[PDB]
Amino acid sequence: AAKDVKFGNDARVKMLRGVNVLADAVKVTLGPKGRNVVLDKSFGAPTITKDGVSVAREIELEDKFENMGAQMVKEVASKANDAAGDGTTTATVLAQAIITEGLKAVAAGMNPMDLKRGIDKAVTAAVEELKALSVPCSDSKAIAQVGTISANSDETVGKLIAEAMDKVGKEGVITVEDGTGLQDELDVVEGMQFDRGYLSPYFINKPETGAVELESPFILLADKKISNIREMLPVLEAVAKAGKPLLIIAEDVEGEALATLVVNTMRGIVKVAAVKAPGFGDRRKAMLQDIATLTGGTVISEEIGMELEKATLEDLGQAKRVVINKDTTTIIDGVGEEAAIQGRVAQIRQQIEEATSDYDREKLQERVAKLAGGVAVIKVGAATEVEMKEKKARVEDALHATRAAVEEGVVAGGGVALIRVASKLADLRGQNEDQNVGIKVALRAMEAPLRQIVLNCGEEPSVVANTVKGGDGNYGYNAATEEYGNMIDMGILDPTKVTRSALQYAASVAGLMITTECMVTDLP
Amino acid sequence: AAKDVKFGNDARVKMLRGVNVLADAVKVTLGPKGRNVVLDKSFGAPTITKDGVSVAREIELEDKFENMGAQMVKEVASKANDAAGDGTTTATVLAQAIITEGLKAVAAGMNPMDLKRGIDKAVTAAVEELKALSVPCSDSKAIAQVGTISANSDETVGKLIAEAMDKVGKEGVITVEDGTGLQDELDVVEGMQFDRGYLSPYFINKPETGAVELESPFILLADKKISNIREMLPVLEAVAKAGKPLLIIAEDVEGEALATLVVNTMRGIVKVAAVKAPGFGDRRKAMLQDIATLTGGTVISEEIGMELEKATLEDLGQAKRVVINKDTTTIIDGVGEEAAIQGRVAQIRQQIEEATSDYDREKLQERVAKLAGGVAVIKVGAATEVEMKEKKARVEDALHATRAAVEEGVVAGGGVALIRVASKLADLRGQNEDQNVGIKVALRAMEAPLRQIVLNCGEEPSVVANTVKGGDGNYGYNAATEEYGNMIDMGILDPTKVTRSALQYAASVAGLMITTECMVTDLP
Amino acid sequence: AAKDVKFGNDARVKMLRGVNVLADAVKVTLGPKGRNVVLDKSFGAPTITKDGVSVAREIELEDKFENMGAQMVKEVASKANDAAGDGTTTATVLAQAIITEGLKAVAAGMNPMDLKRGIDKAVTAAVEELKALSVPCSDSKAIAQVGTISANSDETVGKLIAEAMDKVGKEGVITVEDGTGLQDELDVVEGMQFDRGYLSPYFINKPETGAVELESPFILLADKKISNIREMLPVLEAVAKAGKPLLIIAEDVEGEALATLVVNTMRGIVKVAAVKAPGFGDRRKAMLQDIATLTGGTVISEEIGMELEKATLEDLGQAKRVVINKDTTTIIDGVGEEAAIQGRVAQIRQQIEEATSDYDREKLQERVAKLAGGVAVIKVGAATEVEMKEKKARVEDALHATRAAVEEGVVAGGGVALIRVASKLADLRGQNEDQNVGIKVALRAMEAPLRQIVLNCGEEPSVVANTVKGGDGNYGYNAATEEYGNMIDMGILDPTKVTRSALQYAASVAGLMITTECMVTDLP
């Protein structure tokens, strides 16, 4: 189709307008005293939310170039959220600050590539400073404290998360399920999790969670890429008559098979989720065999000769529950002989014993760990169904935050880690003057989020920023109580991973938009 | 003719727009780092000035109501400048701050009259605080220091001002004249100054200062109101054939005589300035007799018998030089035998002892003081004519500033006296909540000028404002050196009269606009 | 009248547009390969010129704000031309470069005052570097060489200039005149020159040179300011019936006297030029008496007793020729007794002998020098009237250039002195980063004129600029011959005063325009 092309200054101005619109939409929700945004719905009842994720998801501009700018910032913020579990608003406001200042500098006549180099150097130094400033969260007490902070200052959720980490390990798999009774239940069941996601977004059973959830589904284990529906059509009919959902994992699913699976899911006649197999080659085959051992099923292997057409229901694997997300897939409580699992892990241990290369030893150890560790299940209990759902959501959020914390520690939250890092880095220099300007741009951008928070609070931004800068360590300004102190002891924590990811993704998108020269869109 | 009438909110909005235009025009020239404003001229060469007085004088808008707002802010600022010798920009920015906040509060629903009452109460308390904070300027060292500060840190001007004040007295009259030689000369001549001014601006000889200056002029002394030109026509003809200027003082000059004199002033055939007689009643006749004794002329009084037609050149009083301003008129070195002056002052003293009432004694003492004190003339000299004119202008400005200082002391200049006073008054209260809102409005408005100065300096206004508020006394921020400390020690001095007048006039005009409800203007 | 007010960015943008228009109009006429500009005339035949002064004079824009910007740049360029005799185009192009870069920086968020400080610092360092780089032009050989270079490589003009300098002195007064015969004639006659100029441009006899010239005029000498024409109707009538012009010099001429003199000059019935007396006070009276001795006239002083009506034709001073310019007035061949001049010079020298203070000694020394040195008259002779006028114009231009050269030496012309200086100042630094940006702006602006010259020549600007920067000393690029080498040897000489004045005035106007925030101009 005919295209509209913008060059240089005009394209950058349009992108800046789009970024400004999206950032002004999402920034008012930043901070404990953040405002709320009204999102319209076709149903009739508007939705009022203080969550920046929803506001970002609902933003799309009429102008095409401004739309591209908004979509770029939205995509990088979503990547930050997926990597960390928070910081979408922080990443967006940081990106807006860097983009605005960098475009001002570019309009001043400075070299965009040198500006990007300076931004990258400043951000790398900032990541180093953040790693220096982070405090570990390895002890169970710190884990419980972080979990309590994440779940709106609830001690029960923190205690539950700490118990789960103690039972399964900090690197173990923990999932949250509904609790039958009033009291909460924690148990460890056989299961495993891999890094493959769903093939199609239409598989999403729960749009609010954004993940596919199946109750007692069937497992298909194929060593070949699935392309024709007719190959597994008898299996699909057997699943449909069985009345239970089906989860299929193989090399790949493409073409008419994927199309008909999507159509069936939309019609809802059969609940089928398509997920690729983990790894590749010998590794995908070994992990498929491991999953077969876990679920008690059989791998449909072409070299063996076993075929999908002759596959039966009893040959398929079975699990009590599976959760599929775009980033990972979890198998929870697969039915299978414990003796079979013990034999499999013993075989993997032997393979480690005669393993020679360190890479193979590490891979086999990872496999045996993810096979023998199991999955810890958290059953959230409450008196009322609605409060039980709210508690489950809070527990999920706290679990994600605690995972990030145990991954990378915690820093002084509320946007003061960035201002402290900028204060430490104020003496950085680059090879060229434009690099120095880029470094200053990055420093001011890292200043920005705390200013936005305290502007949402209604307080003076510059004065609070100066006061926090004059301090040291984790000393900072508390938005809720409107009074300074040690941010760690006051209960305002942010995992180091969240801040680091937000800063890095904001820097990347800002550099990409600063070094942008041409813009190609469809005509209105 | 037809009129356009605005009611309530929209009229106040037009005021806000006009005041905003004028205040943004004049407020950028505030502070040592103040910007400059380019003013167009019909001749062709634009004028670049950092003086808020000229910028205010040039401002006149096209919308009639915005023009009203700008014109009345201009009028009150001009009144402040005339009363104090400086502070037009400060008065205008203070008025804009009060007007903006008060109009916002009025639109919020608070009663305008209560807001005006609160503003007046806060301003009265602020005047009291300013009087408390002012340091005296009575000693000659402080007088010299203030004079030096006023004349761009020049010690010679301050020393000249201090020694002239010591020679003639603080209440004495000091006049600046061109010096023939390189060195500066000061001499005391016989003369006096009264508060009457010229009838119309069309007599202004030099538009730069807006004052009438005459070299060796003639003095006309009439105890009757001048209305007809033909009464003094022979006197005017004698003056014209003599070639020297003439100064006429009488009860009043109006009608055909005033019209003919003004037309002659534009035509330039005869240069005559018209000034009303000082005082009223028998006091007026006594002061006219004193003028006659000083200048050696004769008073043309109807009751005595002589007529202006019978008046001759010898009957006219003669002086070496006179200066006429709309605020006061000065008679310098009037020629006359010193024996007559001694007899007249002995006569005034004998009424001094024979008088009984305190009012009459005080007024006679004032008369004898102003008659026997004389006039101190400062002859400013330099190497070349242009720098001599520049030094004369600097000396005149320093003289005005030192007169204000000895009148009411000095305070910490640079706009920090107002912020200190607001910090002191932060605990004020009123009868009604609307009065409290007005008080807070006045406090923030007094904060505003320092914020404007430090914004012109490029620094953050809020941080500097709170840093100054944290201190006490005359501790403040130096705009020129970009560093804090004691404002008096740094030589940043503002006369207390200047700040007091600016605050009071800004408050008055702001109350007038806040309580304004209707407007009448000609149609476009 | 109603005014239009622009604030901040809009005003600066309009100024940038106006300056761009003016600088593009005048910049094409820079360098030996400079293009030519066609200017309209009311007569019908357009004027084609390569002279940037005329192009700048004719420029005037419709938009009021752009017109104000252009007029400011025009005014500073004209001041530079008056001070130096050349460099209007260089000043304008330098001003445009600084203004463009500084406005870019201001839009980038730099502090305008710090930018102006950096510009001033860099320009001061550049002036010091220029003084270091200048070579003296004191000996007669260099004077003749510079005169030859200025007059299109004509050795005769150089030799006449050199011999005139030898005869009267480098600080003497030299004036050019039409030659009766073919041979050029030089002679020294009595006369003097003072810095006072004409009161109004309407006195200009010949607009081509912008100066007032009179043949055998009468001299009026008054110690008092002239305001009334009635004082000198008889003298004017006597002059008119005599038929020769009249030159009047007094303290000042204002009002109806100036108006009627302008009217008489416009009508042409009586041609009289009015110039203020030199000096002020006692020095002014002494200089007037010296002029009276020189021209044989009498000073009409009120205090001595004589008066203007009492003045006659014989009392008026007489001179063979006088030239009046807005910067100075020259009296040439004033007829007077040689014995009177000898007595006056002996009196002045013995007054010097008895003089004590250094300032009085210097004043009397300059008086005696300007009274006894005389005026050297150059009679430019040729064979044809038109070529005689062309040679006279060339000789006058060469005289101006030689005066500038002997004042401050010569540097490598053709715009390479500025590029060399900017090369030397590569390591200059300021207190703030904004000051450094301003310094870089000034350096690039000083680069600009050579780039413009070589762009007019059609060659590559950047390559030539870098080649000249790589060199050192007076090495540079020749525009006429398109080949590098030493610029002094090729005869591309610009007086150091011209380049220094152009740079300083461009910097001043650029700082004024960078620090400008508001405008006031009449509505369209």
Residue whose C-alpha is closest to residue C492's, from C223, C174, C199, C150: C150
Residue-wise burial string across A44-58, b where 16 or more C-beta atoms lie within 10 A, e elsewhere:
eeeeeebbbbbbbee
DSSP result, A5-67: EEETHHHHHHHHHHHHHHHHHHHTT-STT---EEE--SSSS-EEE--HHHHHHT---SSHHHH
Query: How close B462 comes to chain A (CA, Å)?
Result: 7
Which residues in chain A have their CB less than 8 angstroms from residue C104's CB? 107-109
CA torsion C172-C177-C179-C183 (nearest 10°) is: 30
What distance in Å separates the CA atoms of residue B231 and residue B236, rounded to the nearest whole number?
10
Both tokens of residue C89? 């185009």
State which H helix or E strand residue B1 sits in.
none
Residue whose C-alpha is closest to residue B123's, from B351, B435, B395, B474: B435
Which residues in chain C have their CB less than 8 angstroms from residue A436's CB? 433
- Do C299 and C170 have their domain in common? no
**Cβ separation of C523 and B62 shorter than 8 Å?**
yes
Helical H segments across B201-323, by residue range: 229-242, 256-267, 282-295
Task: Give the type of residue at A274.
Answer: A
C477 Rama sector, left if φ>0, alpha if ψ -120 to 50, beta otherwise? beta
Annotated binding-site members of B: 29-32, 50, 86-90, 414, 478-480, 494
Which site among B462, B464, B467, B469 would you substitute to test the A interface, given the most A Cβ atoms closer than 10 Å to its Cβ? B462
Which residues in chain B have their CB less than 8 angstroms from residue C64's CB? 40
Query: How close C279 comes to chain B (CA, Å)?
Result: 7
3-state helix, strand, coil in chain C (%, to 5): 55, 20, 30
Residue whose C-alpha is closest to residue C173's, from C151, C148, C192: C192
Residue whose C-alpha is closest to residue B376's, from B160, B119, B183, B203: B160
Cβ atoms of residues A96 and A59 within 8 Å:
no
Q: What is the CATH number of the domain that holds C441?
A: 1.10.560.10
Which site among A451, A454, A460 would you substitute to test the B interface, given the most B Cβ atoms closer than 10 Å to its Cβ? A460
Quickly tell me which residue has 């008096």 as its tokens.
B488
- Do C185 and C313 have their domain in common? no
Cβ atoms of residues B421 and B442 within 8 Å:
no
Per DSSP (E only), the strands in C134-245 are 173-178, 185-189, 191-194, 211-215, 218-221
What residues have CB less than 8 Å from C390, skipping those under 6 apart? Answer: none
- Do B416 and B320 have their domain in common? no
Cβ atoms of residues A437 and A118 within 8 Å:
yes
What distance in Å separates the CA atoms of residue B47 and residue A298, rounded to the nearest whole number?
93
What residues have CB less than 8 Å from B470, skipping those under 6 apart? Answer: none
Both tokens of residue B300? 């043309």
Annotated binding-site members of B for ATP: 29-32, 50, 86-90, 414, 478-480, 494
| CA nearest to A464 within chain B | B463
Q: Which residues form the domain of B121?
A: 1-134+410-524
Q: What is the CATH number of the domain that holds A311?
A: 3.50.7.10
Collect all residues from C whose CB is shorter than 8 A from any CB in A.
104-105, 107-109, 433, 436
CA atoms within 13 A on the CB side of C24: 7
State which H helix or E strand residue C389 sits in.
helix C385-408
| CA nearest to B37 within chain C | C518
State which H helix or E strand residue C445 sits in.
helix C433-456
- Give the number of other CB atoms < 10 A from CB of residue B54: 17
- Do C130 and C142 have their domain in common? no
Collect all residues from C whose CB is shorter than 8 A from any CB in B.
1-3, 5, 7, 11, 64, 68, 71-72, 75, 111-114, 227-228, 230-231, 255-256, 259, 279-282, 359, 512, 515-523
User: Closest partner residue to A108 among C108, C433, C436, by Cβ?
Assistant: C108
How many helices (DSSP H) and strands (DSSP E) are in chain A? 17, 19
Collect all residues from A whose CB is shorter than 8 A from any CB in C.
104-105, 107-109, 433, 436
Which residues in chain C have their CB less than 8 angstroms from residue B48's CB? 72, 512, 516
Q: Compute the C-alpha angle B243/B245/B246, nearest 5°.
A: 125
DSSP result, A116-169: HHHHHHHHHHHHHHHHHH-B---SHHHHHHHHHHHTTS-HHHHHHHHHHHHHH-
Of A351, A371, A391, the last residue of a domain is A371
The three-state secondary structure class of B6 is: strand
Of C319, C354, C371, the last residue of a domain is C371
Annotated binding-site members of A for ATP: 29-32, 50, 86-90, 414, 478-480, 494
- Do B119 and B141 have their domain in common? no
CA atoms within 13 A on the CB side of C95: 39
The three-state secondary structure class of C172 is: coil
Both tokens of residue A137? 């969260």
Residue whose C-alpha is closest to residue C522's, from B35, B29, B61: B61
Both tokens of residue A382? 């409450």
Query: How close C326 comes to chain B (CA, Å)?
Result: 16
User: Closest partner residue to B268 among C64, C255, C517, by Cβ?
Assistant: C255
What distance in Å separates the CA atoms of residue C516 and residue C5, rounded to the nearest whole number?
13
| Structural domain total, chain A | 3
Collect all residues from B whose CB is shorter than 8 A from any CB in A.
460, 462-463, 466
What distance in Å separates the CA atoms of residue A241 and residue A269, rounded to the nearest whole number?
10
Neighbors of chain A by Cβ distance (3+ pairs < 8 Å): B, C
In chain A, how long is the greatest CA-to-CA distance? 74
C480 carries a ligand binding annotation: yes
| CA nearest to B22 within chain C | C5
DSSP result, C52-89: HHHHHHH---SSHHHHHHHHHHHHHHHHHHHHHSS-HH
Whole-number Cα distances in Å, A261 to A237, A330, B158: 13, 21, 95
In SS3 terms, C324-367 reads as EECCCEEEEEECCCHHHHHHHHHHHHHHHHHCCCHHHHHHHHHH
Which residues does residue C37 pair with via DSSP β-bridges, in sequence order? Answer: C49
Both tokens of residue B62? 């096209």
Query: How close B33 comes to chain C (CA, Å)?
Result: 7
Query: How close A444 comes to chain B (CA, Å)?
Result: 14
**Cβ separation of B458 and C111 shorter than 8 Å?**
yes
Residue whose C-alpha is closest to residue A218's, from A272, A277, A268: A272
Phi, psi values for residue C212, rounded to 5°: -95, 125
- Do C174 and C223 have their domain in common? no
Both tokens of residue A156? 């029960």
What distance in Å separates the CA atoms of residue B92 and residue B194, rounded to the nearest whole number?
30
Which residues in chain B have their CB less than 8 angstroms from residue A463's CB? 462-463, 466
Task: Give the type of residue at C7.
Answer: F
CA atoms within 13 A on the CB side of C169: 9
8-state DSSP, A202: G
Integer-rounded Cα radius of gyration of chain B = 25
Residue whose C-alpha is closest to residue C290's, from C341, C324, C335: C341
Phi, psi values for residue A519, rounded to 5°: -145, 120
Cβ atoms of residues A193 and A383 within 8 Å:
no
What distance in Å separates the CA atoms of residue B233 and residue C333, rounded to the nearest whole number?
49
The experimental method, as deposited, was cryo-EM
- Do C360 and C226 have their domain in common? yes
| CA nearest to B44 within chain C | C71
| CA nearest to A465 within chain B | B463
A216 Rama sector, left if φ>0, alpha if ψ -120 to 50, beta otherwise? left
Residue whose C-alpha is closest to residue C388's, from C156, C162, C211, C212: C156
Collect all residues from A whose CB is shorter than 8 A from any CB in B.
460, 462-463, 466
**Cβ separation of B37 and C111 shorter than 8 Å?**
no
| CA nearest to A460 within chain B | B462
User: Which residue pairs from A56-61 have beta carbons closer than 8 angstroms and sit at least 24 positions apart in sequence?
Assistant: A56/A22, A56/A25, A56/A26, A56/A88, A56/A89, A56/A92, A59/A21, A59/A22, A59/A25, A59/A26, A61/A18, A61/A21
- Do B244 and B145 have their domain in common? no
DSSP result, B461-512: HHHHHHHHHHS-TTEEEETTTTEEEETTTTT-EEEHHHHHHHHHHHHHHHHH
Of B346, B371, B396, the last residue of a domain is B371
What residues have CB less than 8 Å from C241, skipping those under 6 apart? Answer: none
8-state DSSP, A201: G
Query: How close C405 comes to chain B (CA, Å)?
Result: 26
Interface B:C, Cβ pairs < 8 A? 95
What distance in Å separates the CA atoms of residue C112 and residue C115, rounded to the nearest whole number?
5
Which residues does residue B149 pair with via DSSP β-bridges, in sequence order? Answer: none
Residue whose C-alpha is closest to residue A162's, from A184, A192, A194, A190: A184
Residue whose C-alpha is closest to residue A65's, from A106, A21, A95: A21
Sign of the Cα torsion C224, C230, C234, C236 reads positive
Query: How close A463 comes to chain B (CA, Å)?
Result: 5
Whole-number Cα distances in Å, B169 to B290, B403, C253, C406: 21, 11, 38, 55
Which residues in chain A have their CB less than 8 angstroms from residue B462's CB? 460, 462-463
- Do B334 and B456 have their domain in common? no
3-state helix, strand, coil in chain B (%, to 5): 55, 15, 30
User: Closest partner residue to C3 among B46, B61, B458, by Cβ?
Assistant: B61
Q: What is the CATH number of the domain that holds A393?
A: 3.30.260.10
Which site among C280, C310, C431 would you substitute to test the B interface, given the most B Cβ atoms closer than 10 Å to its Cβ? C280
- Do A186 and A276 have their domain in common? no
Cβ atoms of residues A288 and A221 within 8 Å:
yes
Query: How close C113 comes to chain A (CA, Å)?
Result: 17
- Do A455 and A510 have their domain in common? yes
**Cβ separation of B267 and C282 shorter than 8 Å?**
no
Collect all residues from B whose CB is shorter than 8 A from any CB in C.
21, 24-25, 28, 33, 35-40, 44-46, 48, 55, 58-62, 67, 178-182, 243, 267-269, 271, 383-385, 388, 457-458
What distance in Å separates the CA atoms of residue C420 and residue C257, rounded to the nearest whole number?
53
- Do C14 and C110 have their domain in common? yes
Residue whose C-alpha is closest to residue B252's, from B306, B173, B197, B214: B197
